[model samples]
Target: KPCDYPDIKHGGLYHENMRRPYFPVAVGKYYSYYCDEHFETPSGSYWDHIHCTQDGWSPAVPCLRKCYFPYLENGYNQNHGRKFVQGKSIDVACHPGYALPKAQTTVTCMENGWSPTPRCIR
Candidate 1:
């Protein structure tokens, strides 16, 4: 028997490590799939390969929601990406004319969004 495509959302799906969705995957076999840009698995993993146990895909929901790179008004981040996994932390550098508040150069992604917000002030 063969396994069918998964009901993945947020652009989650893959084929041979590419962004190709839906392939002819047979039962008892396992394959890998990655979350699209700006999205990641709830557990923060970018890829999830599961077996076709004939009961359905191992993980019915491999990807759900994640956090986007925080936008700084007068600075740039050392971490580069349009999206980041939850609980991820990155450093923020300010422009030559501005400085970081409280000397905290790092920001953490929280449930509500970026923690400490991100401020570059004169």
Candidate 2:
């Protein structure tokens, strides 16, 4: 069961409304609002992934679903439309002596989850 991205800030809900929602493959094969699509790498981070989407665009089902939950919001809905394995957050912490400039940094689930690689520095 996955959760719905509650609050939908920073055009979150607005964006989702425009495109179809993404579901994990583990959730079972079905007509997801979105479909898998490839995307360009971000300015930073050296890694990326094939995405999926229904509206604007997305990389992969896993990437899209990763946006919501622990990273952006808490209290996710384990049950969304069907019984699926809720996506989890991959906490990225800066190494010792390096501190995150922002209290929290976010990696969007895009065609490429992330790329180039992120470094905490002055």
Candidate 3:
């Protein structure tokens, strides 16, 4: 009967190799969890794992970076995919000629990630 450090949110909890267990951790111990740098997981992969059954950790919402559909040189992201979690507010355009500065289309995914970061000009 042991297990703690759950209450995940954004991301945290880590334990390198050699695996060490102590602070409320036992039953089939386990560790490792990362999802800070922007974030990633939820089938994305930035780091995973968190065990200690008997009622505790088990893939507890790994991580999520969000905001990463921006690579516009000529511009292109009419809302699709490439990573968008947090606030999620995609929408970009600009190809022929190029534009998107004053009439900024869109680009949201707050929480220290994206927020008026996507661009596309000529």
Best by TM-score: 1
Identify the runs in model 2 with alpha carbons over 4 angstroms from their true place.
1-34, 39-87, 105-118
lDDT of 1 by residue, 90-121 (tens): 78899899988888888787655678777788
Q: Model 1 — TM-score against the truth?
A: 0.45
Clashes of each: 0, 28, 2
Candidate 1 weakest ten by summed lDDT: 12-21
Taken over the whole model, the C-alpha lDDT of each candidate is 0.69, 0.31, 0.69
Choose 1 or 3, whichever is better by TM-score: 1
Error of 2 at 74 (Å): 28
Cα lDDT, model 3, residue 15: 52
Tens digits of per-residue lDDT, candidate 2, 12-98, equal: 222445434543332222222222233112312223332223432332222232222222122132422231122323344554565
Per-model TM-score on C-alpha atoms: 0.45, 0.24, 0.32
Which candidate do you rate higher for lDDT, 1 or 2? 1
Q: Show model 1 residue runs off by greater than 4 Å.
A: 1-40, 43-65, 77-81
- Better candidate by TM-score, 1 or 2: 1
Q: Give the candidate order by descending TM-score.
A: 1, 3, 2
